[PDB]
Design a protein around this ligand. Structure first.
Ligand SMILES: OC[C@H]1O[C@H](O[C@H]2O[C@H](CO)[C@@H](O)[C@H](O)[C@H]2O)[C@H](O)[C@@H](O)[C@@H]1O
Ligand SMILES: OC[C@H]1O[C@H](O[C@H]2O[C@H](CO)[C@@H](O)[C@H](O)[C@H]2O)[C@H](O)[C@@H](O)[C@@H]1O
Lengths: 171, 171, 171, 171
C-alpha cells in the first residue's frame, strides 16, 4: 500500500547484533526524536561501521548490563543507517521522561569539534522521513538535542548547531 | 573522640542557589557513589567556583526544568565542596536505576586530559569520610564512575583513572 | 563460586511434590521476574501451605498435563518460599514470549482484595535477593506484574499495588 | 529492610515485643555462635510462635528484670527466625565469659526427647549466612553448643546431636 519507500537501513542481522532482551514497546505515532552522539570513534566504511555498531552495543549490554544497545538507530559517516531497537521497542537514551515518548537516533562519533559528512546528515534526515511514511513518527515530529533534555555535551558542539537549524527542531 | 567531625561544605546560601523544589527522599545509609564531571569549565577561587555552581544549577533547573541542580554535591578545584541537593534528597545523575540508591558528586570542569589538583581530590574524599561519619553513606560503600553506569565519557579518562585507585571503587 | 548468602526455601521432597518431568533450561542469568497469584485458597501454617503447594502442582500436572507446576517458586502466607521448578528450569506462567526469559514466583491465594502478610512479602524479596547472590538473577533484574505481560488481573489489584513500590519494578 | 540477603527475619514490631533497654554494644565481628533451647513450650505456626516469643521476653523483662529478651535471635518450628537483641546489642545467654564475644540463637522448645523440624534447622543456618553477609559474624565463625560453654542440659540431647553435624561446629 503506497510502498513507504524509505528502507535503506542495515538490519541487526547484517551488522551482527547480539540478540535483544528488551521487550517494552513504544506507542506509535511517536512525537519526539532526540539526537545524540556516541562520543566514541567515528567510522567511514560499511565495514568499519559494522564493527563500531557492534562495539557501542557491546559497551551497552556487557558493561552496563542493558537489554540491548540503548538507541533506536545509529547513523554512520558511511552514509548508512543502522538498526538498533527500531521503530517499536522503547530505547534507553534520555531518561524516564523522554524514553517512553521518543525515538533516539545517534551519530557514531565525537562531534564536539567536527561536522558529520553530508551523506551522514542525509541518511539522518532521510531516516526521519521514513519515520513519517511508516507512521512511526508524527507527520509533525519534534527534533531535540540530547543536551536539551540531559546534562550532557551530546550531540557535540558543531552537530548541535546543525540540528537547531532543522525545521522540526523545537527549543 | 568520635562526633560528626565532618568536612566543610559550602552551604547553598553562600553560593546563592535558587530554591530547591525537590521532594524525593533517599533512604540512608546509602551504598553507592557515582563520580561525575560537569564537562564544563573549571574554577580556582571560592569566588569563581560559587559562580560555576550557579551556571550548572540554572542550566539544570530552567533549561531542563528540574527541581534543583542534579548533583548532591559539587567539588571545586578551589578545594571546597559545594552543596548540591545534599545527603537526603534523591538526585538526578545516573538514570532511574542508580539515582535512588546512590549519591552524586561532580567535579566542576572537564577532565579528559586534565587531572584535578590534590585539593579537589582531598575535598572529595573528606566528603565521603564525612558521609560515613554521619550515617549518610554505608560504611562499606562503593564508588563507581559515571561511565560505569551509563553511556558517557564522564568523569573524564584521567579522573576515572584516579577513582579506580580508591578503595570503595568496585566493578 | 559466588554465593554471598541465600535464603531458606522448602524443598520439593518436603512438600511432597511429584517428580518433575521438565527438561528445558532457562539461560542464565535471568533479567525478568513476573509476580502473579494462584487465585486459589490461602494458608498460614507450614502444614497447610505444603498441602496447598501440592494442589496447585497437581492441577497443573494431572489436569493441564504440564511437566510440572507452572511457577518457579511458590510463596506462602506462612512466610516460607516453596520450591517449584526452581532457578534452572523454564516454567509455563505468562505466555511464550515471556516464559523463556523470566522467573515466575506466585503468591498462594487470590489477592484481589486481601493483602499478603508482611512475612510473605519478605519471603519473596529475600528470594529475589538470593537469586542475585546465586547469580541466577542479574543485579539488574526487573520485577513485572503478570498483568503487565498478558491480559489478566493475576497479581491481584492490591498485591499489584504493593509490588509497584518495590525497588526493581518496571513499567 | 535489615541490609542485603537476610533470610527473612521477623521484626520486634511484628511479634509485639516490648521496648529493649539494653545499651551494651557487641564488638563486631563476632566469632562464636551459641546454640541453646528455651526449654519452654514449642510452636509450629507463626501465630503461635509470636505469642511464644512474647512469653520468653516478658519472663526475662518483667520477672527476671533484664533489659530485654536474653537471646539475639529465637527460632520457631514454624520455620521463622525471630528478632530479639539482634546483631548489635550484646546478649544474655551464656554467662560473662561468653556473652560479650558470641551471638546467641535459641530454639523455642525443649529438645531432649524431641527433634526440631528441618525448616527450623534450615532457618538457623540461613540466619548465620546473613550474619556473614552483614559483617556481624566472621566468615570463619565457630558454633558451640550451650553445654560446651556452661554446665547446662540445653540445647537438649536431640538438638545437640544435630549441631555436631554442622560444619562450623568446633570442639
Ligand atoms: O484472576 C487471577 C488469575 O488471572 C489469570 O487467570 C485468569 O485469567 C486468565 C487469562 O489471563 C484465564 O485464562 C484464567 O482462566 C483466569 O482464571 C492468571 O493466569 C492466573 O494465574 C491468576 O490466578
Ligand atoms: O536442659 C536444658 C536447660 O539446661 C539448663 O537448665 C536446666 O539445668 C539447670 C541447671 O544447669 C536447671 O537449673 C534448670 O531448671 C534445668 O531446666 C540451662 O540453664 C537451660 O538454659 C537449658 O535450657
Amino acid at each position: 500500500e503506497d510502498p513507504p519507500a524509505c528502507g535503506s537501513i542495515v538490519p541487526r542481522r547484517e551488522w551482527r547484533a547480539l540478540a535483544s532482551e528488551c521487550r517494552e514497546r513504544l506507542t506509535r505515532p511517536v512525537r519526539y526524536v532526540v539526537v545524540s552522539h556516541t562520543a566514541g570513534s567515528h567510522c567511514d566504511t560499511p565495514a568499519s561501521c559494522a564493527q563500531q555498531a557492534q562495539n557501542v552495543q557491546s559497551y551497552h549490554v556487557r558493561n552496563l548490563g542493558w537489554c540491548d544497545v540503548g538507541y533506536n538507530f545509529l547513523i554512520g559517516e558511511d552514509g548508512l543507517v543502522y538498526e538498533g531497537r527500531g521503530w517499536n521497542i522503547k530505547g534507553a537514551h534520555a531518561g524516564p521522561t523522554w524514553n517512553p515518548i521518543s525515538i533516539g537516533i545517534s551519530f557514531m562519533g565525537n562531534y564536539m569539534n567536527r561536522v558529520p559528512p553530508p551523506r551522514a546528515l542525509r541518511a539522518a534526515q532521510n531516516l526521519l522521513a521514513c519515520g513519517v511514511a511508516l507512521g512511526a513518527l508524527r507527520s509533525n515530529y519534534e527534533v531535540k538535542g540530547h543536551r536539551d533534555v540531559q546534562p550532557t555535551l551530546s550531540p557535540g558542539d558543531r552537530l548541535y548547531e546543525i540540528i537547531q537549524t532543522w525545521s522540526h527542531y523545537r527549543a
